[PDB]
């Protein structure tokens, strides 16, 4: 005879674990979320990381806890880019009739 039965504690594991060891799970990314950091912590994350990787420039990958510091920086320093996009605009018509 084989068999083994199962049992998926949840997303929650570790989470959890350090709600009862510690008090609350926040963000392990911003640490900005509810208070209980259990529903708004699957559902925040979700836009979390989009937002993160925004903030995140990418000529020199650093991070800025301020979307409007961001803009400031990005031109700053990184005002002209090493590439331009091409100028091909053409193709025109003039239809005229009754
Ligand atoms: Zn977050
Ligand atoms: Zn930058």
Redesign the pocket.
């Given at each position: 005879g084989s068999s083994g039965s199962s049992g998926p504690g949840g997303p929650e594991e570790q989470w959890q674990r350090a709600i009862h060891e510690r008090g609350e799970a926040v963000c392990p990314t911003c640490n900005v979320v509810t208070r209980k950091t259990l529903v708004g912590l699957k559902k925040h994350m979700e836009v979390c990381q989009k937002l993160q990787d925004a903030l995140k420039?990418?000529?020199?990958?650093?991070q800025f806890k301020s979307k409007a510091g961001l803009n400031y920086?990005?031109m700053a320093?990184?005002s002209a880019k090493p590439s331009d996009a091409e100028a091909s605009e053409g193709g025109e018509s003039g239809p005229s009739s009754g």
């Open positions: 420039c990418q000529h020199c990958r650093k920086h990005t320093e990184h």
